[PDB]
Amino acid sequence: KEKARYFTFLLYPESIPSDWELKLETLGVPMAISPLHDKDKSSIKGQKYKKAHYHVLYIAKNPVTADSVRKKIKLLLGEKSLAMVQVVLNVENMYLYLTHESKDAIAKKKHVYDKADIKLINNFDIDRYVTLDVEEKTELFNVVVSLIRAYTLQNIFDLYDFIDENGETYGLTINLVNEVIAGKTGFMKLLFDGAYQRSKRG
Amino acid sequence: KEKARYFTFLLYPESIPSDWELKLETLGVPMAISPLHDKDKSSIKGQKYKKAHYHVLYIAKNPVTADSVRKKIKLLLGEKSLAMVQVVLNVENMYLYLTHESKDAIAKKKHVYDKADIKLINNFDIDRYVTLDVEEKTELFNVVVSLIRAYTLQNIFDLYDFIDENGETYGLTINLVNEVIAGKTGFMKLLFDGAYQRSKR
Amino acid sequence: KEKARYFTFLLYPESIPSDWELKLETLGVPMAISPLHDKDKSSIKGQKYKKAHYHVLYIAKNPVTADSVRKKIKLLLGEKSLAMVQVVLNVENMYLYLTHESKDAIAKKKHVYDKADIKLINNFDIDRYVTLDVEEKTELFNVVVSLIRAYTLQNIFDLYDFIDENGETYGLTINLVNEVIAGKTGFMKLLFDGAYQRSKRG
Amino acid sequence: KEKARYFTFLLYPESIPSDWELKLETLGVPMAISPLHDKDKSSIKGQKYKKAHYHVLYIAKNPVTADSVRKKIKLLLGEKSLAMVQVVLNVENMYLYLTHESKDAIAKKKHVYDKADIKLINNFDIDRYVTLDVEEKTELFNVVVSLIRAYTLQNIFDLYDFIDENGETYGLTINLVNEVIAGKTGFMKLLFDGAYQRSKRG
Amino acid sequence: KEKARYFTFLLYPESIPSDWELKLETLGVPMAISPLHDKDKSSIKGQKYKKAHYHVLYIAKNPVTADSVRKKIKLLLGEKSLAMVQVVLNVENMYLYLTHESKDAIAKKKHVYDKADIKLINNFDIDRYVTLDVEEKTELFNVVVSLIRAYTLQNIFDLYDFIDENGETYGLTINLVNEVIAGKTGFMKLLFDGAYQRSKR
Amino acid sequence: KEKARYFTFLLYPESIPSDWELKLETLGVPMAISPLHDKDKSSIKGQKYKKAHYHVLYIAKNPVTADSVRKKIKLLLGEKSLAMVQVVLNVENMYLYLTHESKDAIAKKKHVYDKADIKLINNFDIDRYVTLDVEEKTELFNVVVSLIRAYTLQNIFDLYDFIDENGETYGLTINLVNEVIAGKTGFMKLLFDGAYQRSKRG
Ligand SMILES: [Cl-]
Ligand SMILES: [Cl-]
Ligand SMILES: [Cl-]
Ligand SMILES: [Cl-]
Ligand SMILES: [Cl-]
Ligand SMILES: [Cl-]
Ligand SMILES: [Mg+2]
Ligand SMILES: [Mg+2]
Ligand SMILES: [Mn+2]
Ligand SMILES: [Mn+2]
Ligand SMILES: [Mn+2]
Ligand SMILES: [Mn+2]
Ligand SMILES: [Mn+2]
Ligand SMILES: [Mn+2]
C-alpha cells in the first residue's frame, strides 16, 4: 500500500496489441521505454537470449500505489500484459538501466543497447527527474554567491549572461541556477542590492 | 468489483427521449457529450456513415462500478439506449476524443467535429480535470524565464501580451502562465527587475 | 491520520445527562444541533420509528483528529453518549441534512422536520462556514486577472471600485475577492505593477 | 498520553505549605488561582459547604501531558497536594469558572466569588488565551478592509489612530487589529498602496 | 524510577580536590556553579555564616535518575563531597538562585552574590534554557508596536537605540527584540513605513 | 511517526548477497560503510569476538520514516540482511563511531579500526552533513546583528567584506553567514535599511 510516483514493469511483444505505444500515450502519463531487450544473456540451460521484452519507466502525477498502476496498464493493454510493477527507488539508475548503461549493469557486463532506440512518451525527459540533494543545492548556492560578489553581478540577467559564458567552469547552467535559487529569491534580492550599490561606489 | 470515477458510453438518438439532455441533468453529475457523431466512416459496404451516436463522458461523485452506471441510465433513458460503457483512464484524452482531437483519434485519422457542438451538463469543466505535474511546472517555468530574457519583458502585462500572440509556439496560455508562476512571484519579481534595468542600459 | 474542522455525530437522549445542551456549550466550539430525530422511518423496518436521536454539526477551532472529538465529548457527556463521528466534506449539506432538507433526503424523501427546533450553540452560523474550493478559487483568481488586464486596474482600490459596479457580471463581491486573493498578494503586486506602468505608456 | 498546554487541578490549604504561592511561582509557568472556594454548596448529608479549595488554571509552555504536570506539582508542594489534573478544554469558560461566573456556573446558581481575589502568577492574563477563530479573523479582516477604503487610510499609523477613536463602533482594538492582520501584511501593503495613490488623485 | 534532565546539589570546598572545576569538565555535561556561598546567614547560635558551599546546576544529556548523578560525582570527587541532590523544575529559577536573584530568594531576603563569580562548565548558557511562549511573544510584540508609535521609530536602528536606553522599563533587550520580531518582519516593515511618512508630515 | 534524513543500521555478511556493496550504490543515496566489525569484544562474553557485522551511515534524500528505510533495503539485500535501524541525532558522532573513534567508544575503549576500510558510496562526504543547531543559529544571528549595528554595514557585500577580514574573531565564515541568515532575509533587509539611512544621518 506504499504510494510513489516512480514505477517500472515489463511488456513483452507477444501479449500486447500492435499499437501499444499509442495506447500508453492515451494515459497522459510520462514514460520511458527501453530499446527492445532482445539480446539479454539468459542463464536457463541451452537458451542464448531471454524472451524479448521492453522496460517501461513510468511516472505517475501524484503518489499512487503499484497496484493502481498495474490495473491501469491491464485495462489498457489486456489483463495478460502485466503481472508485477516494482516501485523505482532510483530514477536515474533505472533510466540508465534501460540501455544497460548503469553502474550495476556495467559491472555485470550486460548487453548495451542504443540510446536512440529509447522511446519517450508524453514529453518524458530524464533531466526533469534528476534533481539536486539539499547539500548540492547549498553547495551550488554558495558558488552562486561568490560569483555574484566576484563579478559584482547587479541582477539576474547579468548572472544569467555570466552563466551562459563561464557556466561550465563552475558546474552551472541556466536551469540549474533556477533550481538552485528557488525558494531563495529574498536572499537573491539582498545580493543584487549589494552588487547594485557597490558598483555605484566605484 | 471494479470501481472507478470516470466513465464513457454511447447514446443513440433513435432510442432516447427527445429531452434526454435535460434528463441527464436530473442525475447530478458533471458530463460532457460529444457533438452528434453522424460522419463516422462505416466499414460496412454500401454505407457511408455509422448510425449517428453521442459519446458521453460521465463523472461519478465517488468510485462506482460500471454496472451501477449502466442501470442508472437505463432507468433514466430506457433499456435500449446504452452501448459501450467503459471506464476512462485519462479524462482529458476522452474529452478530446469527443471531437476526435485526441492524439490517438488524430492518429487513426478520424473525422474532426466542432468543439462548439459539445454539451456540458452540470457545469462540467475539462480544466478542472487537468492539472500540471511538478515537472511540467518546472519545465514551463524555465520556458517562461527564457521568454522573458529573449524579449526583455519588463512586467507581467508585457509577458501576458507576448503570450496572447506567440503563446501556442511555446505551449503557453494566460491561465497556464498563472498556474505556472503561482508560488514563484518573488522569482518573477527578480526577472522583471532585470528586464527593466536591462532595457535602460 | 486525517485532521479537519467540520464534524458530525449522533446523540442518544437515553444516555446523555439532562443538562447536555449546556455541557456542550461549555466547549466554546460552535455547533448546530438538529431538532430531535424521532421519525427515522426504521432502516431495518424493525419497529417503524427509529430510536430517539440527535444530529450534531460540530466545528473545531483548529484542525483535529475525529477520535479526539469523541474522547472530548465522551469525557464530556458520558461513555455511550455518542455514536460514530464523521468528518464532513460539505458543511452546507450535512447541515440541511439535519431536518432532512438536503438534496438527497428529499431525493430519498425522509421525514421533514422544522428549523425552529434547531439549536445554535456558541453563535454557530451556517453561513460563516460556506467556503470556496480550490478549483473555484483558481477559477475566480483567473477572472480577477483578466479584469485587471482588461481595465488596466492600477491598485486594489481601483479593483474594489470596479467590483462595486460590475461585480455581479463576473460573479464577484468585495468579500469574495478578499477570499480569492488571500495568499496571492505577491501575484497581485505583479499585476498592479504591470497595470501601473502600462497606464504610463499611453 | 494526550498532550496539551491548558490544565487545571485543585489545591486544599490543609495539605500545602504556607508559601505555596511563591513556590508555584518558581515553576516559571503562568497560572490563574481562584479566590478561596470556601462557600461551595455541598450535597453530602448535613454538610453546608465543601472542604475549602483553590482552583488553579495552569498553562504549560509546550504541549505536555497531564501526568507530567502532576508530578511537577507534587515535587513542588508534596506528594499529598495533588491526585488529578484535568486538561482544560476551554480556557475562557474555565477562567470565568474560577469565580463561578461562567454560563454553566451561573445556571447552576453556584456561589459567586470576587474577581479581585483571583491570583495571577507569572504575568498570566486571560486576554492572551482567548483568541479569534478563523471565521472571526476573516470577518474582522474584511471590516478592516472597508475601514481602509472608507477612510482612505494611507498607512498603519493612520489605521491605528482611527482605531483609537472609532474602534468600539466596529468591535476593534489595537491588539485585536494586530491579531487580525498577522500573516496578512502583504495584503495590508496592497491596501495602503491603494490608499496612498488614491489620496494623490484627489 | 524518577528520571529528569535538570539537577542541583551542594559542593563543599573542604572535601573536594582543588582542581574540581577541571574534573567536572571530564563529565561532558553543561553546568553552572554559584560563586562561593560563604555569607549565607547561619541560624546556629554564635555563628555568622554557614560552612562555605557551592551550588551546582547540572544538566544531563538525557533523562536520568538522581542516584546516577550522585554516584557520577562521588566517583569523580569522593564519597563525602555531596549534599542535597535535587531535581530542578525551572532551570532559569535555579540559575538565578546561584546568586540569590530569583524571586523566591529575594523573597526570603537572602544575600546577593556577584553574578560575575559564576562559573560555566562545558559552554553552559542560560539563554539556551530559556525561551518565550507564544503568548509572551505576542505580548512583547504589541509592546514593540506601541513603542514604535509612541516614539515614531523610523527603522530598526532607531528601535535598537531606544531599547539600549529604555529597554528595561519595558522588559526588552536587543536579543529579545530579535526573538520577538522573528517571523514578523513584514509587519515590522509596515510599522517603519508608517513611522517614516508620519515623521514627514 | 518520526521522519528524518540521517540513519544507521547493521549488516550481517552471512545473509547479504556478495555484490551488496553495489546493490546499495544502486539507491543513489550517499552512505558510509564501516570497516568490517569483526572485533566487538563480546557484550555477553559468550564467545570473545562478536559476530561479523557492518555499520552503515545512511542519508536519505528527503525526510522519511525509519521503517521505510528497512523495507527499502530488505527488498534490496534480502529478508534478514539488516538488524534494527536507528535515526541519528548526531551525524559526526555515529560516524567516528564507525571505527570506534567517537568520544564514548574511546571513553568506553573499544577495538579501534582503520579509516581506510571505510567505504564511501555515492560521494558520501561526512563534512557536507555537519550542520548548525537551532540555538547556534540563533546565537550567530544575533552576533551578525550586533556586527551590522556596530559597523553600520549597509548591505550584504559590506557584511561579506567585514567577515573576510574579522570573521574569525566572531566565529564566522562566508558559508556560515549564508547558513545563518537563510530564512531570515526579511530581517536582513530591515537591518540593511536601518544601516543605510543611519549612515545618511551622519
Ligand atoms: Cl522560487
Ligand atoms: Cl501565487
Ligand atoms: Cl493574504
Ligand atoms: Cl505577521
Ligand atoms: Cl525573521
Ligand atoms: Cl534564504
Ligand atoms: Mg486544471
Ligand atoms: Mg533562549
Ligand atoms: Mn532486460
Ligand atoms: Mn464515434
Ligand atoms: Mn436521523
Ligand atoms: Mn469549587
Ligand atoms: Mn546557599
Ligand atoms: Mn560494532
Curated annotation (Swiss-Prot), chains A, C, D, F:
GO terms for molecular function: DNA binding; DNA topoisomerase activity; identical protein binding. InterPro entries: Plasmid_rep_C_sf, Plasmid_rep_OBD. It comes from Streptococcus agalactiae. GO terms for cellular component: extrachromosomal circular DNA. Is essential for plasmid replication. Nicks the positive strand at the plus origin of replication. Keywords: DNA replication, Plasmid. Belongs to the Gram-positive plasmids replication protein type 2 family. The lineage of its organism: Bacteria, Bacillati, Bacillota, Bacilli, Lactobacillales. This is Replication protein RepB. GO terms for biological process: DNA replication. The keyword rRNA-binding does not apply.
From Swiss-Prot, chains B, E:
GO terms for biological process: DNA replication. It holds the Pfam family Rep_OBD. InterPro entries: Plasmid_rep_C_sf, Plasmid_rep_OBD. The keyword Transmembrane does not apply. The keyword Zinc does not apply. It comes from the Bacteria. One of its GO terms (cellular component) is extrachromosomal circular DNA. GO terms for molecular function: DNA binding; DNA topoisomerase activity; identical protein binding. Keywords: DNA replication, Plasmid. Is essential for plasmid replication. Nicks the positive strand at the plus origin of replication. Belongs to the Gram-positive plasmids replication protein type 2 family. This is Replication protein RepB. The lineage of its organism: Bacteria, Bacillati, Bacillota, Bacilli, Lactobacillales. The gene is repB.
